[PDB]
């Protein structure tokens, strides 16, 4: 009991936490590994994601060597604040939380040879820039970059504890994604240069693919059916002027309702996405189906249609006959071009 | 070797008084500032502010922190900043700001042998930006960031951009959702008052709003509806059911476009360029339906007591006037 107490008090006599280990003598090498407990939700509107990790850092400090019956020393969180630790920060972090419920979720362990292990539980909210030009058929590689804030490449270097592929471990139930599919992650390290010097940056990229099934049922299928519905009016007799007029205008109103709702499910960006062009083309087709009838009606000589018992009657418009072929063909050709363009990337 | 560094730091901090600026009784201490911008996000028209994250560096010379015999720059623990003097620099138009503290407080203190001190901060600040949205969405914005000293005049402290025009980096790497940074400027000036001049630095941007989404979702559908209302002019005047249903449904469609864009677009309670065009298209479809009522009254009301002239006249004037309305509109706002 008293032996354990003596070593703790003896450790910090003469220690200076303001100086990194091996200052002016060598480079402080830090070995890091990350265990992701949950890859939280990805916010398209904010272009950011949340991640819950157990962050580990290991390094050697000769100033903390001790000899005693125990081989590993467990430090109180108060004592862990009196010892130099790496000032690791996330370059793309936006607002991270270091949990301290019900106690600070930190743990500092010292071995007899002066090797320190520093594990902390963190919730990191990091920005993931996205190119939404192929929405909703887009894929992203959300990064997670961290490194030293104040110590250059010549003072502190970071390394992965194991092979980089195996250093970042994601839990089997880690994924908490509703709209994306976590395909995997790539782990690498690099060098960045700033106005304050060269720094070592450890990067992890999480590769996400958006689920398309929701947009097919909510947006793509109703738009296709509405365009088919507008082209259905070509099979009505030309003498049903009120019927084809109401048919034409109400399909335009139906498309307008669908277009507005489909945009509300997309984050507020001012450039054109892939779904915007599909709706715009569908809008043009429904618009043209009503202009086509205006041309057909302009040549309808008689206001009475054919009767079952049988006088001369109006013939089937040659404009209507061609429209029954051109409009379904042109829309079908557009669909093949549209899907082959985006599903082959 | 390391033990020598420990005593040097103790000597520098022995007798150091953080209540006195460098060269307290002499010339003002020149503070050089440069900013590394990480990202700009949440450019809010409703709140008239933007949020940016930046690396904020400050340079000044403190002869009290000059050391000899060590050919290295002493990067110390970030907690040593509380034991030194730092400028009282604040952002004048800042509404809400904080310093990131994961995994530790993101600040640095680097000492140089001649006494130069580098004090860097990673700050996320929401800065106010008063926006003139009368030309929305065909508008440009100018959002600034004012840097001032709270309690020191130009006799005590001075500001300048270290590196000149290269002081601020990372501007060209920013990608805003609905904007596009055209240019940025650095301004150094003194705020002259009766008491004295106060140093101030100003970093400003010029934001140009992208128009692609508005063309596809606001202007083009409104143009198509207006053109559809002209179809009534090519239907026989006696087709009351066909012409009225076409006329009144385009009015309903325009109302649907206007009301739904009101909810989707940011709440900006004054007349903008987008509202004038939507209102203009609403009037045109209103007049197309009103045109038929005049035609129908002439033939049936005043009839017993030619109606193809009013339709022939409308088949030209309506396409001509709407194109003229577009010509005046797009020349005014562009």
């Amino acid at each position, epitope marked *: 009991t008293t032996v354990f107490t003596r070593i703790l008090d003896r450790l910090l006599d003469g220690y200076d936490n303001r100086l990194r280990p091996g200052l002016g003598e060598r480079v402080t090498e830090v070995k890091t590994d990350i265990f992701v407990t949950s890859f939280g939700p990805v916010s398209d509107h904010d272009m950011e994601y949340t991640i819950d990790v157990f962050f580990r850092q290991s390094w050697k400090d000769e100033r903390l060597k001790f000899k005693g019956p125990m081989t590993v020393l467990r430090l109180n969180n108060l004592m862990a604040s009196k010892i130099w630790t790496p000032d690791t920060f996330f370059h793309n972090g936006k607002k991270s939380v270091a949990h301290n419920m019900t106690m600070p979720n930190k743990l500092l362990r010292i071995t007899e040879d002066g090797t320190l292990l520093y594990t902390m539980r963190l919730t990191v909210r990091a920005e993931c820039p996205m190119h939404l030009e192929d929405f909703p058929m887009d*894929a992203h590689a959300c990064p997670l*970059k961290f490194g030293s804030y104040a110590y250059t490449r010549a003072e502190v270097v970071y390394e992965w504890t194991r092979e980089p592929a195996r250093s970042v471990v994601v839990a089997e139930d880690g994924s908490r994604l509703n709209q994306y599919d976590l*395909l995997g992650q790539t782990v690498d390290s690099g060098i960045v*240069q700033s106005s304050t010097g060269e720094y070592v940056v450890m990067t992890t*990229h999480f590769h996400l693919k958006r689920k398309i099934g929701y947009f097919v049922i909510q947006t793509y299928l109703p738009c296709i059916m509405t365009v088919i519905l507008s082209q259905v009016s070509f099979w009505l007799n030309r003498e049903s002027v009120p019927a084809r007029t109401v048919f034409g205008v109400t399909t335009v109103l139906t498309m307008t309702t669908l277009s507005i709702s489909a945009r509300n499910s997309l984050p507020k960006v001012a450039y054109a996405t892939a779904m915007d062009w599909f709706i715009a083309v569908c809008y043009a087709f429904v618009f043209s189906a009503l202009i086509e009838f205006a041309t057909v009606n302009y040549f309808t000589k008689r206001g009475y249609a054919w009767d079952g018992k049988s006088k001369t009657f109006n013939s089937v418009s040659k404009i209507d006959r061609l429209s029954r072929i051109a409009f379904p063909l042109l829309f079908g050709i557009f669909n093949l071009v549209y899907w082959a363009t985006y599903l082959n990337r | 070797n390391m033990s020598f560094v420990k005593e040097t730091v103790d000597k520098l901090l022995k007798g150091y008084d953080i209540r006195l600026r460098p060269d307290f009784g002499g010339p003002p201490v020149c503070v050089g500032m440069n900013i590394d911008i990480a990202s700009i996000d949440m450019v809010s028209e409703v709140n008239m502010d933007y949020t940016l994250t930046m690396y904020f560096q400050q340079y000044w010379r403190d002869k009290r922190l000059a050391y000899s015999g060590i050919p290295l720059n002493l990067t110390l623990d970030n907690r040593v900043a509380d034991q030194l003097w730092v400028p009282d620099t604040y952002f004048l138009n800042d509404k809400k700001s904080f310093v990131h503290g994961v995994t530790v407080k993101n600040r640095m203190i680097r000492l140089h042998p001649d006494g130069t001190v580098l004090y860097g901060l990673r700050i996320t600040t929401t800065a106010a930006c008063m926006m003139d949205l009368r030309r929305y969405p065909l508008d440009e914005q100018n959002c600034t960031l004012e840097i001032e000293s709270y309690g020191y005049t130009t006799d005590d402290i001075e500001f300048y951009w270290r590196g000149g025009d290269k002081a601020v980096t990372g501007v060209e790497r920013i990608e805003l959702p609905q904007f596009s940074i055209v240019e940025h400027r650095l301004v150094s000036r003194n705020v002259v008052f009766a008491t004295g001049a106060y140093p101030r630095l100003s970093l400003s941007f010029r934001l140009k709003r992208n128009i692609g989404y508005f063309i596809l979702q606001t202007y083009m559908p409104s143009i198509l509806i207006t053109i559809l209302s002209w179809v009534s002019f090519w239907i026989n005047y006696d087709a009351s059911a066909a012409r009225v249903a076409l006329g009144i449904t385009t009015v309903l469609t325009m109302t649907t476009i206007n009301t739904h864009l009101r909810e989707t677009l940011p709440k900006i309670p004054y007349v903008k360029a987008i509202d004038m065009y939507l209102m203009g298209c609403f009037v045109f479809v209103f007049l197309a339906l009103l045109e038929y009522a005049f035609v129908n009254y002439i033939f049936f009301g005043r009839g017993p007591q030619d109606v193809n002239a009013i339709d022939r006249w409308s088949r030209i004037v309506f396409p001509f006037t709407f194109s003229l309305f577009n010509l005046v509109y797009w020349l005014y706002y562009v």
Partner: nanobody, 107 residues
Framework: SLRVSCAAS????????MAWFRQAPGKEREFLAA???????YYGDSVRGRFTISRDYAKNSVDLQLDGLRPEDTAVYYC?????????????????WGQGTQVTVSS
């Protein structure tokens, strides 16, 4: 000392990863260097510390600084740009490719 540039036209690559690749005759396509939006620089083992990659975000271009050239480096150099999906070192992750440049080293 040899410096190789790569001009990009028709699209701004501010938020794209611009990389350089080398293809030895008949062997394979080898990753050399890359730089993402955040200016993070990545290098291969065989060219770590030897080659320098720099991106001109204003001019939308990426430059490669070759120093200490060896006869092993005599190959075709390509300029690539992509989103780095499924690793920024794999050649299959890059879509926009330059026409290539031939570098011949004689000693």
């Amino acid at each position: 000392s040899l410096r190789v540039s790569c001009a990009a036209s028709g699209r701004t690559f501010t938020t794209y990863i611009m990389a350089w690749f080398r293809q030895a005759p008949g062997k394979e396509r080898e990753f050399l260097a890359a730089m993402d939006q955040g200016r993070i620089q990545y290098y291969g083992d065989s060219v770590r510390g030897r080659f320098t990659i720099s991106r001109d975000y204003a001019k939308n271009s990426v430059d490669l600084q070759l120093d200490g050239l060896r006869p092993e480096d005599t190959a075709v150099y390509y300029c690539a740009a992509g989103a780095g999906f499924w690793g920024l070192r794999t050649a299959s992750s890059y879509h926009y490719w330059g026409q290539g440049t031939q570098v011949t080293v004689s000693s």
